[PDB]
Amino acid sequence: PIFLNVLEAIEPGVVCAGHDNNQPDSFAALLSSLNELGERQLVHVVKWAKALPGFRNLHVDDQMAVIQYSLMGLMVFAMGWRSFTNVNSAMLYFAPDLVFNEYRMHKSRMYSQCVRMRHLSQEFGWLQITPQEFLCMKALLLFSIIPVDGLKNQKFFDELRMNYIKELDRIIACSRRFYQLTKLLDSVQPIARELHQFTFDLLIKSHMVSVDFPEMMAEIISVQVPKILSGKVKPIYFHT
Numbered sequence: 001p002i003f004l005n006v007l008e009a010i011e012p013g014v015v016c017a018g019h020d021n022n023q024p025d026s027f028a029a030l031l032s033s034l035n036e037l038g039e040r041q042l043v044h045v046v047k048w049a050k051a052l053p054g055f056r057n058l059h060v061d062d063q064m065a066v067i068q069y070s071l072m073g074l075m076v077f078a079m080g081w082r083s084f085t086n087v088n089s090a091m092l093y094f095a096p097d098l099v100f101n102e103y104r105m106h107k108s109r110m111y112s113q114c115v116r117m118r119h120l121s122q123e124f125g126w127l128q129i130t131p132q133e134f135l136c137m138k139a140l141l142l143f144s145i146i147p148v149d150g151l152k153n154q155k156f157f158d159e160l161r162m163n164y165i166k167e168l169d170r171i172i173a174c175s176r177r178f179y180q181l182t183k184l185l186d187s188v189q190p191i192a193r194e195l196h197q198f199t200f201d202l203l204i205k206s207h208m209v210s211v212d213f214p215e216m217m218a219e220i221i222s223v224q225v226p227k228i229l230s231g232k233v234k235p236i237y238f239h240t
């Protein structure tokens, strides 16, 4: 199992947010730590992605664009999984120092999005998703959102996507399963778009609510995320 060996080997380790758990859950505090956490996870997602089989086949500009467009979905999917295996989806395990209970979910003003994510997290139990299926599905999420007008070398992207779908189909090797797993993958995207909308809004009013964005995250939110929210960049859904 060469392919699964590689996915297992490259899987990021623990990322902490740096959150002060002695201060009171304030909107500004929770969100400033979520933004810092997003930057810390991006650093790891970049190194992960670049070690993936075949990823370096993509044009270099397309490499970074694909990582940026898919970052939210990747983080959501992985956090659903951490939640499942750590706390059985009782709470959202964003990081070991940033675990959300209902109260946090309300205080962050992301309650509706958090309930979806915990629902996704519960799915990993309701479907009995294996670690190996989780890893294949996560690698496919990286190849699941692109500009409607295509990437710079779109044939190379299509080839990669095709092969990652095949690897997922093998690991399954039943048609029920593939249907379920592709439906679960599709369910990530509406959640990512809700988070994207929330994040962009927060950046625009960030001065007046006293939330800090790291530079890298501010640049992505102002350059890349609007392309998604304006419909230039859209997810690849399996269904509908």
Ligand SMILES: C[C@](O)(CS(=O)(=O)c1ccc(F)cc1)C(=O)Nc1ccc(C#N)c(C(F)(F)F)c1
Binding pocket: 031, 033, 034, 035, 036, 037, 038, 039, 041, 068, 071, 072, 075, 076, 077, 078, 079, 093, 094, 095, 195, 199, 217, 220, 221, 225
């Ligand atoms: C609100 C925000 O802080 C915005 S952000 O992280 O700056 C961000 C900005 C741009 C993106 F394309 C994705 C994420 C955020 O979504 N953070 C965040 C951090 C960690 C994790 C995890 N795990 C998640 C979530 F995906 F799980 F929601 C979300």
